[PDB]
Structures are given as structure tokens and as C-alpha cells.
Amino acid sequence: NTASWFTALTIHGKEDLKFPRGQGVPINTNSSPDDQIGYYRRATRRIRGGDGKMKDLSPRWYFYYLGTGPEAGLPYGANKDGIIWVATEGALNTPKDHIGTRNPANNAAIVLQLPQGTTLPKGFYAEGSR
């Protein structure tokens, strides 16, 4: 019923997802500068897979706007394992109820894209590539 608006950010390795301050918010042209704030949550569920379903086993992090998702009531900066906070310069510290979450039966996920100039996290590239 509820899901991230964006595809997963897979972090290939045993390191938390991190972004320098002012970076890490996925691009969404249907959002305003005041909205660019939220959290990434590490997915708990393991990959069951099946025929032709071959996802990388490394931890997946899903972006949720502030005031939405499984940690909707957490204030910005709250310390919780598997939760990392991100905010673009100019974003307002208010719940983004008007964006909300995605219903995976009705809308496809937006491919997660980060803007140029973003410092890419350690583990952004799969093992054996770089």
C-alpha cells in the first residue's frame, strides 16, 4: 500500500549510507525547493527472487520525504539505526503530506537520480566494477 516514490539506492558494502550536508535528495521535478528534505531507510526484508529476478544482495536504502513513510513522526536528525537524514539548502522543516508516499499498485517508482556535483557514497558502484 505504501512505498518510496523512488527506486532503491543500493550501497554495495558494510558501510552506512552517507551524504555531505546539503546533498542526497533524489530529483523530483514535481516537487518545490521547500520539499527537498527527508530520510533514507535501509530495507529490512530479504530478496526472495524467482525466475529472472536477480537483484544485488547488498543493502538497499529508500528515500522518504520528511513527515511521510514508516518514520513519518521522526523529527529531522532523529537518531535511529538504518535511518539517515538528507536536506537540500532552502528546504523547510515541515511534513511533506502533499507529496506523501507511492501506492505500488497504481504508480511506478521514479528512477532515483542525484544531481551533478553530488559526492557519491562509498559503495555506490557494485563489487568488481568501480
Author numbering: 48 to 177
Sentences from the paper on this structure:
One central protein involved in the formation of regulatory ribonucleoprotein complexes (RNP) is the coronaviral structural protein nucleocapsid (N). N plays a major role in RNA genome replication, translation, and packaging and has further been found to interfere with host-integrated stress responses and stress granule formation. The latter, together with the extraordinarily long basic β-hairpin finger, constitutes the positively charged primary RNA-binding surface.
This is reflected by high RMSD values of 4.552 Å and 3.198 Å for Q58I and S105I with the WT, respectively. This influences the structural context of the carboxy-terminal stretch (171–174) in Q58I recapitulated in the Q58I R2 relaxation rates for residues 172 and 173, which contain significant contributions from conformational exchange.
